[PDB]
Amino acid sequence: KTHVQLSLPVLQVRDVLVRGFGDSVEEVLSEARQHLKDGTCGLVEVEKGVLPQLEQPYVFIKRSDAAPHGHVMVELVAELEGIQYGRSGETLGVLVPHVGEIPVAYRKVLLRK
């Protein structure tokens, strides 16, 4: 399937134990896609002071369209030193490894895979 319905646990930035996916744009996108498939991916909602507490490169989920079965259609965009690899809509948040942090909410997304 080109799209996959996922429910992403929303984590508080200060609870996050593994603050990024790796050390290159290509690696973080690779790793983010693998974690999304494996159900080991969390979402941090971006506000003032969140991104400096996480590790670059960042992986964003961005709205790709204006929402089947409650699932917002999203795609992945990476960012390193203020340059983004991908073009998409509004940020729903920044992806991180999920290693058992207690979420505050769930974000239903349809991921272009």
UniProtKB/Swiss-Prot annotation:
Region (Disordered): 1-113
Subcellular location: Host cytoplasm
Superkingdom as given in the UniProt entry: Viruses
Chain ranges of the CoV Nsp1 globular domain: 2-113
Function: Inhibits host translation by associating with the open head conformation of the 40S subunit. The C-terminus binds to and obstructs ribosomal mRNA entry tunnel. Thereby inhibits antiviral response triggered by innate immunity or interferons. The nsp1-40S ribosome complex further induces an endonucleolytic cleavage near the 5'UTR of host mRNAs, targeting them for degradation. This inhibits the integrated stress response (ISR) in the infected cell by preventing EIF2S1/eIF2-alpha phosphorylation upstream of stress granule formation and depletes host G3BP1.
Protein name according to UniProt: Host translation inhibitor nsp1
Organism: Severe acute respiratory syndrome coronavirus 2 (2019-nCoV)
Phylogenetic lineage: Viruses, Riboviria, Orthornavirae, Pisuviricota, Pisoniviricetes
